[PDB]
Design an enzyme around this catalytic site. Sequence first.
Site, PDB file in Angstrom:
ATOM      1  N   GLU A  11       0.812  -1.180   0.089  1.00  0.00           N
ATOM      2  CA  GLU A  11       0.073  -0.069   0.121  1.00  0.00           C
ATOM      3  C   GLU A  11       0.751   1.277   0.247  1.00  0.00           C
ATOM      4  OE1 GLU A  11      -3.030   0.023  -0.685  1.00  0.00           O
ATOM      5  OE2 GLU A  11      -3.846  -1.915  -0.223  1.00  0.00           O
ATOM      6  N   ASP A  20      -6.150   6.501  -5.547  1.00  0.00           N
ATOM      7  CA  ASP A  20      -5.426   5.233  -5.510  1.00  0.00           C
ATOM      8  C   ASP A  20      -5.715   4.588  -6.871  1.00  0.00           C
ATOM      9  OD1 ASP A  20      -8.250   4.359  -6.019  1.00  0.00           O
ATOM     10  OD2 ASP A  20      -8.557   3.219  -4.242  1.00  0.00           O
TER      11      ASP A  20
END
EC number: 3.2.1.17
Length: 162
Positions: A11, A20
């Site tokens: 991440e 994202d």
Amino acid sequence: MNIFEMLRIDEGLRLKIYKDTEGYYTIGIGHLLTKSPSLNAAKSELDKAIGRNTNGVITKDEAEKLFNQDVDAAVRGILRNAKLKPVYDSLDAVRRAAAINMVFQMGETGVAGFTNSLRMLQQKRWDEAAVNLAKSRWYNQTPNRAKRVITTFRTGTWDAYK
Ligand SMILES: [Cl-]
Ligand SMILES: [Cl-]
Ligand SMILES: [Xe]
Ligand SMILES: [Xe]
Ligand SMILES: [Xe]
């Protein structure tokens, strides 16, 4: 290696709101703020999650706190899902971390839809499961991350992350 370090590698860590891989506003260690295209909406959700006027910026400790809450929620969600729990409980520790990573990334509904792979995992048919998990939009969109998770389910070791 453990689930936290694993997810911290997949991440990354960002202290300002960012988009994202699907273009959704996120912050920290993959903490999704909203599916909404609105920056203000994301900023309102951030402040509410942190408990202060952040102005789209948080500290490392605050990011780590959201991360702790998110991991906890992810495991707890698996235990609460009737299709997932039995699979998860049948797995060894390493493989359980792989299951948690998928859930953190795509949500429990999402993972609960890999019916066939779930069954293969539960029967401990590793190579078979690995092939089936790769036939998915998940693998085509984030192939490096999917490969690392897939090898983890396949081998039950942390080699993909070393
Ligand atoms: Cl939250
Ligand atoms: Cl990727
Ligand atoms: Xe699972
Ligand atoms: Xe899973
Ligand atoms: Xe899965």
